[PDB]
Amino acid sequence: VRFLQPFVNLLSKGTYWWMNAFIKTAHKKPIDLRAIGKLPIAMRALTNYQRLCVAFDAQARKDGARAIWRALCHAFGRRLILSSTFRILADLLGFAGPLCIFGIVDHLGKNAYVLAVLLFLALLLQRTFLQASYYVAIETGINLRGAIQTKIYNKIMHLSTSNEMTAGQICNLVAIDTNQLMWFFFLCPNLWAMPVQIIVGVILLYYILGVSALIGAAVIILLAPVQYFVATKLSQAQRSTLEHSNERLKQTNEMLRGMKLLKLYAWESIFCSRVEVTRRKEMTSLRAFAVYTSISIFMNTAIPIAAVLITFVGHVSFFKESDLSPSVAFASLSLFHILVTPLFLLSSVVRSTVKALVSVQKLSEFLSSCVQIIGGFFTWTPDGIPTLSNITIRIPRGQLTMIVGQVGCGKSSLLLATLGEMQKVSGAVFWGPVAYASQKPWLLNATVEENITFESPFNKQRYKMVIEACSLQPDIDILPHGDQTQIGERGINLSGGQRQRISVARALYQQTNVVFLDDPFSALDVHLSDHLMQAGILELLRDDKRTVVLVTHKLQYLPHADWIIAMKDGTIQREGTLKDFQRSEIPWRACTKYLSSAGILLLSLLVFSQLLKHMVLVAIDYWLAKWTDSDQSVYAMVFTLLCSLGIVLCLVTSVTVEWTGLKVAKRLHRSLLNRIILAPMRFFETTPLGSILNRFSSDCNTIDQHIPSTLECLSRSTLLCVSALTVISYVTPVFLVALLPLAVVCYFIQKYFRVASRDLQQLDDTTQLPLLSHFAETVEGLTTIRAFRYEARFQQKLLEYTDSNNIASLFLTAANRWLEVRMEYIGACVVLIAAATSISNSLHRELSAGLVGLGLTYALMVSNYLNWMVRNLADMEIQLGAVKRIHALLKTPSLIPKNWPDQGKIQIQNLSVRYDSSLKPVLKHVNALISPGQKIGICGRTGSGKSSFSLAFFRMVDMFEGRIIIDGIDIAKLPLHTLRSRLSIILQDPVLFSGTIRFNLDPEKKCSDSTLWEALEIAQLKLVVKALPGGLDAIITEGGENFSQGQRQLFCLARAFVRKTSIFIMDEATASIDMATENILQKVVMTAFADRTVVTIAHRVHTILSADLVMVLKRGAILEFDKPETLLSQKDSVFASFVR
Ligand SMILES: COc1ccc(Cl)cc1C(=O)NCCc1ccc(S(=O)(=O)NC(=O)NC2CCCCC2)cc1
Ligand SMILES: Nc1ncnc2c1ncn2[C@@H]1O[C@H](COP(=O)(O)OP(=O)(O)OP(O)(O)=S)[C@@H](O)[C@H]1O
């Protein structure tokens, strides 16, 4: 245990002194979950779940949305109200501070040291109570999140299967709804403490400025509803923008997958044009969003100026000509800031409260939704026509029981009913932890060994037996990681047969009596199914005398079982055995590049405008200082001039930040796209897709959403802090020399913070990722988990995960409180010293009263500007560190005028090729020649070098040696664009990117309609194309199920037809295609290609047999042969015929 909050001295419970040791150790050694503590018994999943379920029980025994609400209320009780009362007392003392400022200012102009030390004490106490309030509220919220999370997970166990969309709604119910609830519980005490704050503020300012005060008290208040309105607009804009963004991502996911396909003919620019077309729409939305952001930032600092303007001008020169002592004006200034700070929070509080109300309504709607069988009766509804009718079945021990029938006869339904999964209406069923593999296979977010063990102690002989008996070890070794390979989400990097074999292995490996397998032979061949039923079923299951109940439909399994079960229309037609059935019927460089992408045009326009705005904001008060003592009319007019300058300059600065941020986002995205386009193929193959896709998915989005606002806030905070320091220095010179020590202290407080605040931050992210994912895994494979009776262990795992999340999200708020309190203590020390120097120096000797006003008013508030500064600095640093990876990604004609000849005669003399710079060579002394108009075949085993030969023919490998030519022409003087408008290629991996048929046939779109129609008619595709809406305009999706595999290859051949390269490369147009269709495909491609030399590569016999010139790829080299009928009998059918 390390997080000891409840077990320390009640002084440190306030000032967080126990964090000194943690943060000092954290500076040196990197924090981790082993270096972190464990949550106390006072706050776990179990404790909060216990209190919440006790309250829910006491409320439901007296029987809903209001019910769950009151249950949470009575369950979390005293802590929340304690935080709220801390908060209101702090608010009172904060409203009290400026009045003692006023008293001091009065006394010196006409008992003040006492007021100064009282101000010091009241500041420190008020801020301490505020911080304790924040922390207690945050901890209550974290408790509530853990509690309702484990509660809705407990509910996930008892729900019914009849209720895809529900899974997404469940995981949003944990990712956004629960966060809304918890953040609303953060802001709950603020909603109680805001009204008393504004009421005390208005009544206090009225008694200081009189009737005029009221007028001012209106203006500031009028900003609070307006703000809300602005916020709403933002939200609307956000929605629209998000939509566009999503679409863009889709149009990217294709390009970053058909990489080799894309670059094999250089259609990449054609798709980049479309990608840029989407980007402009996205940019257009962003303008309005940033305009609203600018309006918000503008009002933020405009209302403070406007209040003082329309109040002071409307007080003296309007109403009663009352002499305005410096105390009145400066107290009004202080109260204006102390009231502006809370006003913004009310809008966000209202939004958070309504959103939390909706989310709790949603949570309530969700949260409240032998083997003997005699008289089976049930259905998939609380009321409806039944599908289970009159089923009586006995499943004795040690007996193979097949279930056979037609499609839709209640086979798997009977399986789940035997499981107890479906509580039958009227019937009896008796038989426990039963192993079960469902029809649709499911996996976890873990390794292969883990999925097959499934929380079971590992075995050597047992596990190796199960691995070998499932025909799974070779394909397991085929994976990039021989074992312990991280199986992707749902098994994207695996095939269906592998998932099925893993599921069957999981079912077989578990030690239990009963095993169900819902058709485990649907995605398996004949050989693998035979070996599985022989070794794993009849030899391994039948070994330990288990009760195997397998449902399938084959021939070999019928005489191997004991009981045959025939189902028809949900009824057992006949029953018995076989015989009874047959006898019956971050450095400054990242920011430097970020701002230099904007250019010199806007950098200075931003910086100098900010400097001038802050200079105006200080000069207005500097002139007010001389205004005070008493040409009052001229004074007020100068005040009005300054007030106007301030607001105009603020609007200018905001518009500048907006425009600059948008331009930078534009240029950065375009440069990233362009630099990713020109990368080599081996680079794309080396780097995983997640990192390349992820930068565009988030980095871009993150920057656009948060960099401009956070940068603006950081700049405003730092300049306001520097201005306040300069003010309190100019007021009292000696005070300056006292403030530089303390500020240096802050430097030491800075380092130790960041080197931990960053760390904890990332830890939070990590504990958020496997938690949510875990949830999803439980939802899909719910039947398997309720069948294995493994609910207890999984609930244990989820309590573990939510504890690991809460400890991180708790240490983070503890560290934020630490930095806050210490920076605030120093911000109170500085105002203490400033007032103590001002009372003596500026009164006893200097005798100038306009000074102390400015100094006190700025030192009463310097601390909040300091805190804004430091927090925004931390955020800007993490965001700039996120940006740096974008730059890391950023750093990755004599024969032309003569038309490319149709003579396909080529010759590659002494060719070699390597993949990486200075690695093992792929080819060795490759010499070959190809005659015009002659079909060429190439053979070889896997890894022989035929794909490498094709890629080198398209010079896709960047370490080839020798000279390679086409009609005396090579790659020494031609750019890539000409090199891709000269040859055609059909890859083994076909794809149909989204769009219309015109976008797939000719994405360039140069070709005319009759040309595409003829290409479809020749490619045996015109009839199915005419059977679609519109014709040549069917909206296709990436991959999908809109066309057959043969039709995808027909589209590839149509691409080849329209390419008109006159040279064709056929890279395994045979794999994963039915022979009945592949043979007619090759016949069409032969009858269509009488000219325009084609070089093919495959592992089929007849394809290699039909080619004229063929070269057998040896271990490292090739051996070519010209006449096909001569080399297939010269070696006496040893190396070229039986191999083919
Ligand atoms: C902006 O301040 C305020 C100023 C005045 C008032 Cl009347 C209220 C607040 C205020 O904020 N309302 C209290 C509720 C609240 C929410 C966030 C913060 S916080 O400081 O930003 N964040 C943390 O402490 N920890 C986070 C919490 C989320 C998980 C990760 C760690 C502090 C407090
Ligand atoms: N989880 C479910 N929720 C609601 N209805 C279901 C569910 N599973 C199946 N059904 C319905 O129950 C009917 C019968 O389903 P099955 O028992 O799976 O068909 P079966 O032919 O006996 O076995 P199969 O096809 O190998 S899974 C279908 O028409 C479905 O609409």
DSSP conformation letters of 383-394:
SS--SEES--EE
> Using an 8 Å Cβ cutoff, are 111 and 93 in contact?
no
| Nearby residues of 193 by Cβ (< 8 Å), 6 or more positions away | 84, 87, 88, 91
Nearest CA to ligand 1 atom 25: 813
Method: cryo-EM
Measured CA to CA, the distance from residue 1067 to residue 938 in angstroms comes to 10
Please give the torsion angle defined by the CA atoms of residues 614, 617, 621 and 623, in that order, rounded to the nearest 10 degrees.
90
Measured CA to CA, the distance from residue 886 to residue 695 in angstroms comes to 7
Measured CA to CA, the distance from residue 1092 to residue 214 in angstroms comes to 90
Residue 866 token pair? 């300091």
| Alpha-carbon distances of 643 from 635, 655, 857, 980, rounded to whole Å | 12, 19, 18, 65
Cβ 137 under 6 angstroms from ligand 1 = yes
Residue 527 token pair? 């050989």
| DSSP category for residue 558 | G
Phi-psi label, residue 39: left if phi above 0, alpha if psi -120 to 50, beta otherwise: beta
Cβ 134 under 6 angstroms from ligand 1 = yes
Residue 1092 token pair? 């325009």
Q: At what angle do helices 862-890 and 700-731 cross, to 10 degrees?
A: 150
435: which strand partners? 515
Nearest residue to 705 via CA among 883, 851, 485: 883
| Nearby residues of 271 by Cβ (< 8 Å), 6 or more positions away | 251, 254, 255, 262, 993, 1003
Nearest residue to 882 via CA among 589, 590, 659: 590
* Annotation: binding site for Mg(2+): 412, 439, 518
φ, ψ dihedrals at 977, nearest 5°: -60, -45
- State the maximum Cα–Cα separation within the chain, in Å, rounded to a whole number: 123
Identify the nearest ligand to the CA of 422 by its number: 2
The CA-CA-CA angle for residues 457, 459, 465, to 5°, reads 135
Say which residue the tokens 């709607």 belong to.
Answer: 365
Residue type, 628: T
| DSSP category for residue 933 | T
Residue 789 token pair? 């009776």
> Using an 8 Å Cβ cutoff, are 884 and 590 in contact?
yes
Residue ranges lining ligand 2, Cβ < 6 Å: 161-162, 380, 387, 407-413, 439, 519
Identify the nearest ligand to the CA of 348 by its number: 1
> Using an 8 Å Cβ cutoff, are 633 and 640 in contact?
no
Measured CA to CA, the distance from residue 888 to residue 493 in angstroms comes to 27
Taking the centre of ligand 1 as the mean of its atom positions, its distance from the CA of residue 301, in whole angstroms, is 22
Identify the nearest ligand to the CA of 385 by its number: 2
407: exposed, middle or buried (C-beta count within 10 Å: 0-12, 13-18, 19+)?
exposed
| Nearby residues of 114 by Cβ (< 8 Å), 6 or more positions away | none
| DSSP category for residue 171 | H
Three-state SS at 373: strand
Q: At what angle do helices 268-312 and 700-731 cross, to 10 degrees?
A: 30
Count of Cβ atoms closer than 10 Å to residue 1083 Cβ: 10
> Using an 8 Å Cβ cutoff, are 147 and 44 in contact?
no
> Using an 8 Å Cβ cutoff, are 159 and 366 in contact?
no
The DSSP line for 36-83 is S----TTSSHHHHHHHHHHHHHHHHTT--HHHHHHHHHHHHHHHHHHH
Cβ 190 under 6 angstroms from ligand 1 = yes
Identify the nearest ligand to the CA of 819 by its number: 1
Cβ 186 under 6 angstroms from ligand 1 = yes
Q: Is the CA virtual torsion 265, 266, 268, 273 positive or negative?
A: negative
Residue 164 token pair? 């895809």
| Alpha-carbon distances of 837 from 93, 539, 822, 831, 841, rounded to whole Å | 24, 94, 23, 10, 6
b (16+ CB within 10 A) / e for 1031-1062: ebebebeeeeeebeebbbbbbbbbbbbbbebb
> Using an 8 Å Cβ cutoff, are 912 and 962 in contact?
yes
| Alpha-carbon distances of 185 from 42, 85, 143, 230, 578, rounded to whole Å | 19, 15, 10, 24, 66
Nearest residue to 759 via CA among 148, 58, 25: 25
Measured CA to CA, the distance from residue 813 to residue 802 in angstroms comes to 17
Distance of CA 497 to the CA centre of its chain: 30
Taking the centre of ligand 1 as the mean of its atom positions, its distance from the CA of residue 80, in whole angstroms, is 15
> Using an 8 Å Cβ cutoff, are 705 and 883 in contact?
no
Q: Indicate the helix (H) or strand (E) that contains 649.
A: helix 632-677
Nearest residue to 367 via CA among 784, 48, 67: 67
> Using an 8 Å Cβ cutoff, are 374 and 428 in contact?
yes
Taking the centre of ligand 1 as the mean of its atom positions, its distance from the CA of residue 134, in whole angstroms, is 7
Taking the centre of ligand 2 as the mean of its atom positions, its distance from the CA of residue 519, in whole angstroms, is 13
* Annotation: binding site: 161-163, 380, 408-413, 439, 518, 553, 682, 685, 915, 943-948, 1041, 1044, 1046
Quick one: resolution in A?
Answer: 4.4
769: exposed, middle or buried (C-beta count within 10 Å: 0-12, 13-18, 19+)?
exposed
Measured CA to CA, the distance from residue 319 to residue 217 in angstroms comes to 16
Nearest atom in ligand 2 to the alpha carbon of residue 162 is 3
Count of Cβ atoms closer than 10 Å to residue 905 Cβ: 16
φ, ψ dihedrals at 573, nearest 5°: -65, -60
Measured CA to CA, the distance from residue 4 to residue 40 in angstroms comes to 8
> Using an 8 Å Cβ cutoff, are 984 and 1023 in contact?
no
Measured CA to CA, the distance from residue 1014 to residue 1021 in angstroms comes to 10
φ, ψ dihedrals at 545, nearest 5°: 55, 60
Beta strand 936-938 with 1109-1113: parallel, antiparallel or unpaired?
parallel
> Using an 8 Å Cβ cutoff, are 684 and 263 in contact?
no
Say which residue the tokens 């020109």 belong to.
Answer: 678
Nearest CA to ligand 2 atom 30: 408
Residue 1023 token pair? 């009839």
Measured CA to CA, the distance from residue 330 to residue 791 in angstroms comes to 66
> Using an 8 Å Cβ cutoff, are 902 and 984 in contact?
no
Measured CA to CA, the distance from residue 1016 to residue 929 in angstroms comes to 33
Nearest atom in ligand 2 to the alpha carbon of residue 161 is 1
Identify the nearest ligand to the CA of 388 by its number: 2
Measured CA to CA, the distance from residue 252 to residue 248 in angstroms comes to 6
Measured CA to CA, the distance from residue 951 to residue 1065 in angstroms comes to 10
Nearest atom in ligand 2 to the alpha carbon of residue 567 is 22
| Alpha-carbon distances of 847 from 512, 586, 840, rounded to whole Å | 94, 49, 9
φ, ψ dihedrals at 569, nearest 5°: 55, 40
Taking the centre of ligand 1 as the mean of its atom positions, its distance from the CA of residue 174, in whole angstroms, is 21
Nearest CA to ligand 2 atom 26: 412
Identify the nearest ligand to the CA of 521 by its number: 2
Nearest residue to 1016 via CA among 1004, 1003, 998: 998
Pocket test for ligand 1, best of 186, 347, 353 (most atoms within 8 A of CB): 186
Nearest atom in ligand 1 to the alpha carbon of residue 190 is 7
| Alpha-carbon distances of 827 from 127, 257, 517, 721, 867, rounded to whole Å | 10, 55, 70, 11, 9
Three-state SS at 1036: strand
Say which residue the tokens 């009052």 belong to.
Answer: 632
Cβ 345 under 6 angstroms from ligand 1 = yes
Cβ 342 under 6 angstroms from ligand 1 = yes
548: which strand partners? 515
Taking the centre of ligand 2 as the mean of its atom positions, its distance from the CA of residue 557, in whole angstroms, is 23
The DSSP line for 98-122 is HHHHHHHHHHHH---HHHHHHHHHH
> Using an 8 Å Cβ cutoff, are 660 and 606 in contact?
yes
Three-state SS at 484: coil
Taking the centre of ligand 2 as the mean of its atom positions, its distance from the CA of residue 342, in whole angstroms, is 58
Number of alpha carbons in the 13 Å side-chain half-sphere of residue 119: 30
The CA-CA-CA angle for residues 809, 812, 814, to 5°, reads 110
Q: Indicate the helix (H) or strand (E) that contains 910.
A: strand 906-914
Count of Cβ atoms closer than 10 Å to residue 1029 Cβ: 7
Three-class SS of 1007-1032 = CCHHHHHHHHHHCCCHHHHHCCCCCC
Residue type, 1022: K
Count of Cβ atoms closer than 10 Å to residue 337 Cβ: 16
| Alpha-carbon distances of 54 from 57, 79, 178, 360, 782, rounded to whole Å | 5, 17, 20, 19, 27
912: which strand partners? 961
Q: At what angle do helices 1045-1059 and 1009-1018 cross, to 10 degrees?
A: 130
Residue 1138 token pair? 């039986």
Nearest residue to 1101 via CA among 1077, 1075, 1080: 1075
Nearest atom in ligand 1 to the alpha carbon of residue 182 is 28
φ, ψ dihedrals at 937, nearest 5°: -115, 155
* Domains of the chain with CATH codes: 371-582 (3.40.50.300), 906-1130 (3.40.50.300)
Three-state SS at 486: coil
Nearest CA to ligand 2 atom 13: 408
Pocket test for ligand 2, best of 385, 412, 549, 550 (most atoms within 8 A of CB): 412
Measured CA to CA, the distance from residue 340 to residue 352 in angstroms comes to 20
Cβ 816 under 6 angstroms from ligand 1 = yes
Taking the centre of ligand 1 as the mean of its atom positions, its distance from the CA of residue 302, in whole angstroms, is 25
| Nearby residues of 355 by Cβ (< 8 Å), 6 or more positions away | 180, 184
Identify the nearest ligand to the CA of 817 by its number: 1
Nearest atom in ligand 1 to the alpha carbon of residue 91 is 7
Count of Cβ atoms closer than 10 Å to residue 847 Cβ: 9
Nearest residue to 510 via CA among 466, 565, 464: 466
Cβ 813 under 6 angstroms from ligand 1 = yes
Beta-strand ranges (E) seen in 122-197 are none
φ, ψ dihedrals at 575, nearest 5°: -155, 150
1120: which strand partners? 1111
Measured CA to CA, the distance from residue 1062 to residue 984 in angstroms comes to 7
b (16+ CB within 10 A) / e for 182-204: bbbbbbbbbbebbeebbebbbeb
Round the CA-based radius of gyration of the chain to a whole number and report it. 38
* Annotation: binding site for ADP: 380, 408, 411-412, 439, 682, 685, 915, 943-948, 1041, 1044
